[PDB]
Design a protein around this ligand. Structure first.
Ligand SMILES: [Ca+2]
Ligand SMILES: [Cl-]
Ligand SMILES: [Cl-]
Ligand SMILES: [Cl-]
Length: 205
């Protein structure tokens, strides 16, 4: 009941995407469609990974149409309940907007509430880099996004929900953190988080 009391006191809930809202990892899927899974600072790491992948717009389009991500059981109902209670829901990912916006659309989360990296493409579609000015393009991006949300909307209780260390580290500035191990349990998070769940239903009180 304590967990649910906390969860329900939130006026904004930010969800990590990879391994939390969806079962897979966006960049991992993109690597597969481009045929570089075997060959496969945050910003420096991101550049390196994309340097090998070099995804074209057509390839990203393929991923979206051919291999949509699988929403974690219970997330559709959980977000539905949150929205019916007017809780503002956000998606934050070190992944990419083109992919995350599709997950957002399935959950009725407006694109304005999605914070992720943006891939760049040349006129012919070839990989041209990514928007390095995005908060999610650097280490601690999730916390930076939450700080911006707090400064813009003045939420009184913003909670971060995610499976990894980067999510746990988003609190502060988040007011609370709820670890999620429904897809994969990251033990370091489970052992240190004050709140931790393995099924979104547990929040469906
Ligand atoms: Ca994650
Ligand atoms: Cl992604
Ligand atoms: Cl991430
Ligand atoms: Cl993108």
């Amino acid at each position: 009941s304590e967990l649910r009391k906390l969860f329900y006191s939130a006026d904004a809930v930010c969800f990590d995407v990879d391994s939390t809202v969806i079962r897979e990892e966006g960049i991992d899927e993109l690597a597969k469609i481009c045929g570089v899974e075997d060959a496969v600072p945050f910003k420096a790491a991101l550049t390196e990974r994309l340097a090998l992948i070099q995804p074209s717009r057509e390839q990203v389009q393929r991923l979206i149409a051919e291999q949509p991500p699988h929403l974690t059981p219970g997330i559709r109902e959980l977000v539905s309940r949150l929205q019916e209670r007017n809780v503002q829901v956000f998606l934050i990912s070190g992944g990419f907007r083109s992919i995350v916006e599709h997950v957002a659309s399935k959950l009725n989360i407006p694109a304005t509430n999605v914070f992720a990296n943006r891939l760049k493409f040349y006129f012919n579609g070839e990989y041209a880099g990514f928007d390095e000015t995005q908060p999610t393009a650097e280490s601690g991006g999730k916390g930076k996004v939450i700080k911006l949300l707090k400064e813009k909307f003045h939420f009184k209780k913003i909670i971060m929900i995610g499976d990894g260390a980067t999510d746990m580290e988003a609190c502060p500035p988040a007011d609370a953190f709820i670890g999620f191990g429904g897809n994969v349990i990251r033990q370091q998070v489970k052992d240190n988080a004050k709140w931790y769940i393995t099924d979104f239903v547990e929040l469906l009180g």
